[PDB]
Symmetry: C5
Amino acid sequence: AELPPGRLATTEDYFAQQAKQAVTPDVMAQLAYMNYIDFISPFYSRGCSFEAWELKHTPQRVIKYSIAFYAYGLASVALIDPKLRALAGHDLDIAVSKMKCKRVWGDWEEDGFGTDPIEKENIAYKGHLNLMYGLYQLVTGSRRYEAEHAHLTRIIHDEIAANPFAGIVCEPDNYFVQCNSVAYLSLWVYDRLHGTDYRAATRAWLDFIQKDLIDPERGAFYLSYHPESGAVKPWISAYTTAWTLAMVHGMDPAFSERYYPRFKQTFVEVYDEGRKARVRETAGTDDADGGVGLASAFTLLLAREMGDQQLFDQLLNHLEPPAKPSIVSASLRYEHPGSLLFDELLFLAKVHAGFGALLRMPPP
Amino acid sequence: MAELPPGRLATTEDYFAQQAKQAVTPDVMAQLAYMNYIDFISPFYSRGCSFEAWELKHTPQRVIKYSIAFYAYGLASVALIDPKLRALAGHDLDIAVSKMKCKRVWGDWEEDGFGTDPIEKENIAYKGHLNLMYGLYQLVTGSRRYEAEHAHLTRIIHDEIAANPFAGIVCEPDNYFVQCNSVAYLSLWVYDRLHGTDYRAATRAWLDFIQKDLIDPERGAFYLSYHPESGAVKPWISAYTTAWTLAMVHGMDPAFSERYYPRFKQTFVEVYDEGRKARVRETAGTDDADGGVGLASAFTLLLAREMGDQQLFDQLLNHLEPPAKPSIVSASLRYEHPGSLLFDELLFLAKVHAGFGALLRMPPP
Amino acid sequence: MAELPPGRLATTEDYFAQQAKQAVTPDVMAQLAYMNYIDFISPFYSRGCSFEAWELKHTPQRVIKYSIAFYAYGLASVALIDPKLRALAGHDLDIAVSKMKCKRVWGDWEEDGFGTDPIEKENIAYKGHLNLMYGLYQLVTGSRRYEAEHAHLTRIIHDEIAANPFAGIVCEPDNYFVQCNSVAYLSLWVYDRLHGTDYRAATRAWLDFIQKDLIDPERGAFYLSYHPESGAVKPWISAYTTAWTLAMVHGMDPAFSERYYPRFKQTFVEVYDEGRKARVRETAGTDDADGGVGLASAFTLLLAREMGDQQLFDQLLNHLEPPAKPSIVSASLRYEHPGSLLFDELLFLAKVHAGFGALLRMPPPAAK
Amino acid sequence: AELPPGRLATTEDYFAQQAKQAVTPDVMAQLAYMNYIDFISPFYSRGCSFEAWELKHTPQRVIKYSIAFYAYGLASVALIDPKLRALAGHDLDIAVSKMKCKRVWGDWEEDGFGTDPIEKENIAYKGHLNLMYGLYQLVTGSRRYEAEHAHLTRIIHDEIAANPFAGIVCEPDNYFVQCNSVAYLSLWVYDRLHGTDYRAATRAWLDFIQKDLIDPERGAFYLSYHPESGAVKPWISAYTTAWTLAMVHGMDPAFSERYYPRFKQTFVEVYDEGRKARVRETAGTDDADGGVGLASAFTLLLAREMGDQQLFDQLLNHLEPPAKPSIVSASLRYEHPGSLLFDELLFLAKVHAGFGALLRMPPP
Amino acid sequence: AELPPGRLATTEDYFAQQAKQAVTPDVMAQLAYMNYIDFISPFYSRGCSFEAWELKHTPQRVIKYSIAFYAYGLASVALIDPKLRALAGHDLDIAVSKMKCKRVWGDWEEDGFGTDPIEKENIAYKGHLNLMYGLYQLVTGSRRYEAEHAHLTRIIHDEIAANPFAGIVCEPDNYFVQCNSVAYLSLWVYDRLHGTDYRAATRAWLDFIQKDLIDPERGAFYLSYHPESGAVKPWISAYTTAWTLAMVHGMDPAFSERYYPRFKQTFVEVYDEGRKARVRETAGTDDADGGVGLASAFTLLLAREMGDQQLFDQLLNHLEPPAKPSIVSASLRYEHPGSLLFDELLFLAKVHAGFGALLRMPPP
């Protein structure tokens, strides 16, 4: 394939990494950014230092998501190159240590919701942590976190079982389909490691979200659900849908395959003579990447998850060149990241092997 | 009017027809998107004691209680306009009551050294708005989530009125404002409507009392404030004081507002630009518009809406909205140059307001 | 008939005629609007311990007590000018006493390590003004709201005077200033008017003491300060010190001030601009105006009003007001470029000031 | 005598102040700066308020020296104009009060050396405090600090007696001849007031500093001595030498008279056709006023103490004009003070009657 | 030898310092920077004052390395000039005192790792402290810290003896060869002072670091080791290698002699017609001095250690001129330091007599 202007590698080369059992030079240079420099690299230390996040101005509320998306990408690195599996394991150990620091979960207390980030609700945080415990153990074969993983999985299963709707809230009375999708995927990973059947609750969840929470004609989820009133916020969200369909594809591929083409019709604008694409965050607008500004970046991951090389290429042509990447001393930096979680999501999308393939990761 | 004036988002006829068509205009929907859409920073994201939405628009602490109350009054009319938005409006009103109880909102009462309990006595500015929000939440949703608190706060207000030698309650100790009383008395009308009680009976003594030292009947205007310890009435008339008070009273005694409304307009409203616009003088003996707190024009927009005055509504919105430079980006409404405090709140409320009488008569869910 | 000078809001004739016409000038009414109008940020919005008005004008913490006191002194004269405004003056004065008692105002006493109680001993800068304000509040309102505190503070002041070997009371330990004493003594005259006591009897000994080493009688000017531990008098004369002291002493011993006033003018006052303007040197051996704290001209405006010197009042107001760029926006007064601390306070007080003697003799209020 | 460009008064006028029993108008304007304006003048209040030093941006560690040097100048004012002796005594009472505030000595604790600044060592602080006690009592005849003075003098005498080298350190293991010189002068002032013989220890100290601590060829002291190691830092210091010789001239005039010509030869650069002088801080350089930047200012004091009118004029012609003095409302300010302790040291040099003449101050 | 452009002294003059028994005038001006100015010179006081490091903006985490590098230089100054041996001893006393201030070690606690910086792990701090204890005693012959030295050496020996890998970690689970190299050298110094055999553990360490931790053909260490996972971060580090080979050369000169020419092949770029050289920090890049930016500075020290005058000259021609050195008042300053630890590492490189020579230092 031709290398498009301002791109670091072809779409062909990203998709061929697993078959070639090697990451591209630019993915290796991202792993150098993540690992190389003393003190300021994100995976320097298991300690509760956040220098790397302070230098890139990560908002405190988003650090949990930065760590989790790096972790999901490290899981795929483990599957692509057996020679990097040991380093991916070490990084996932650090990702879990950091994820447990109060800098990361502390907004739960500061917002007045409680002192224990695990106890009830707060699925945004404990969903990602529970999936990271699982991915760490698939990659390493280590039981370092097994006691905590066993405990968190049961709290999540108990909370689902107790609730009259299918799933768990974040803040009291804030239900989001995307944070539930991570928690359910965390049960599939636990079942793969332990031979359990926590994943059985998934069928009732996929029935529930296909009623009030989706517009099936547009293949788009509504912004949020609030059980106390039963209110559904009447705006569809592209970044919400992209994330949800990506994770659900690892659990019920038919569900995400049913809605993906309607999702693209609803939100994806192809432009620049077919070379590029950008994603509208909601209906009734021409504007790309409104709201949190992550529709195009989450759609890049969804395109990778669904095997859509054409939309992957169009989106990366939109996202990467204006961010002006360069490799200095074999380490990747972007001069003009276009969004929150920018290096994280471009990393994850370049390497992502599929949530199903991570579930079925062979032992070391 | 049916032509779209320059810089306007929708016609005056469109705002006034929302209830008949059982749909909000797209710009009102885009305001509801501003209020509800973006994680953490939207004002109605969470019931938590987070105020990011207010930090980002530099709302002064002492005004946050007013921002929340005005959003709440707007959301009660949205519930009446479009039955499909009623559950969302109930949700937002639940968040508005929760936030209203955060110490960031009422904390000025302690920090000014007046006490540690914002409802115990006085402080009618804060607890009048809270008590009206308890009522409007329960009319919109039929939920009794707040009934215990509502039953308590209504009785504290009724007891304080009954105990005072003057009709009503003070804010700070010894500071009486007619506009903050007007909200407290409306809260008793809403409680009575829900419970079949007669707390609203004290209204007649109040309406009799404010028509004495506190109003200029000829100019149809209220003086700034009353100070019972000294007997002092501050000797300046206030448009924003008058506009807000006439709007709320029109819900309880429409004849009272109808008598003073035309004289209020003569006293304060400047029509300009060949009849296309209007701006409101805050006090007498000046040519300057929107002096003082800067809210005379905005509160007159609400009054015009309440009184069914489409011409003045159009004129005021032509003055207020275009220079604020509205735009809709990703189906969400933003103003580049808000002209005043409480700007999106008061323009939202005025665009949807069904009338305080219609909110009192709101059918069940 | 009188001509409105360039940049002025009203003639000197109009300010001096307010009491006779029983009405403040529109610009004085617009100052009372500034003080009373806007929720939260107007200085007399609430009796609470909020200082938003003083934050907005960058008033240094140490000067807030003076700002409140000078507002109070003006409001007392407003009560005298226009009976219809007397209730409003009374309400503002109630607020001024409440704010005066907030620790934001008196707190410097603790912060500098002098003690936790601002009225116990010394600190005459604070409790002189507070004692005078207790008095004027009661003269204006006829209210006994603060009578208990006033009786206490008056007796603490009299006791401390009686117990010192010099005539009067210090501010900081070992810092004696005639200007802060003049306020304390005037507070005893006001208590005496209200209660038919004779605390004012100590005034004679004070007027004899301040005319030994504390004055240059030939130049009609007080020295900066006295320090009883050493017996040192700082050897510089001060115009703002003298202007303030003579204005207050004129309400107690008019002959004392009538004696020194012409020498004070020759020493300090520079008439300029073909006789239209005047500015005041702060000390001797300089051509420079308004040095030091920078209040010589503004305190001399008050003195000119107190002495009935319309010519010097006009000249000083022609120097002070036009460069401050006054404007009335929505019937409320603002200065773009205040020339000094306490600027709107001291111009308000000078425009309305009925004389400290007239304040002493204020008739009681009309019944409810 | 001709007034040089940018000068306020002639060298002749400064040196004739005591004979005329009057300070120059410019020294009077400095006393106005020190005393005039409420709260911000350095001598407003005996309280622990340091507004004046905050506005000049005095470093915390330097406030103790600024107070001492004002005090040394106020002692000479007392001798020059009897009419100003009560003012100088008042100012000296404030100087001593302020000297005892934690803002002034608190570096001793912050640096972890102790919570009591007079207990042991710390001679920089307590040598200046002890001299100030004595000068306050010579000027005023007041016994207000006599108890403290009697205690501090004995603590200093005890520490000298207990040390195997002649003198006392500042920080532990840091010996400086210039901070010792102040401590020894304080013993001469206590002896003048009480008839004691604490000054007897001075001959041993002068014998000592003339061994390892001085360079006899250059008439210059080395920067410092370090007892634990025996190290003498191998650089000569002009500001060290000027201050030390100025103070020693009050105790042993022949000593300062012996080194003074060599000191000038070594450090003093005459320039501008004989009109100006500037002082090198160390050997092996052409640069003036390196190090702490006080060589020229302390040499102005030394020239005054030694009666050297020519070098006094040359140094003040270098120091004062560029600092752009002005007298506004009979008060002195410099727009461009060229060093730390600038107004303090120019005040002191202008008034200084000699440490010997301060020793012999007749009573009030 | 010709003085190259922008240089203060020839390479010939640096290397001949020991033979001439004198430091160059620029090395003496660096010692004047380190010692001269009251309060702000780094070696002014033994107390917990860090103004010198505040003024150059040293990151908190780098201060320990700044003190140790100065210490390593001062030890060679002792050997070069007997007349400066006492001043060097005094400075090393201060270096050890400052090293024990919580400003220096406090990050151990701040990062959640413990309240005691020497109890376990944290080899980066206690390796340097232990080397400094030993170098202080070699230069001075003082037993002032012998109790602490005997304690710390034993803690280091016990922790080596307890680990299944050869050596000790920094943070938990962070193993760096360069930080170990300092710890082992500290044992050689202890053994030199006491006749003990703690250095016997070195052979197992040198065997361990030549397995997965080195690319023997490129003469380069990988960035780090992480025993819990067994991961080696898969990037070679020039700065890691230059520091490690320098310290090892004093313990096993054959080890460093074998790798040095392969190291230079791998990382060193000679440019400007053979006159200059700059060092690449990792493989697969043309960029010089990436990462922590110290590759060139550490290679300067290694060239000095290996007696490679040609590469020393080339590196100093790259590092020193762009930094615009000047001598003002006989004190050295750099207008544009090119890196962290700049004046520290150029001082050490200029004086370094070799770690082997410091081991063999004869008594005072």
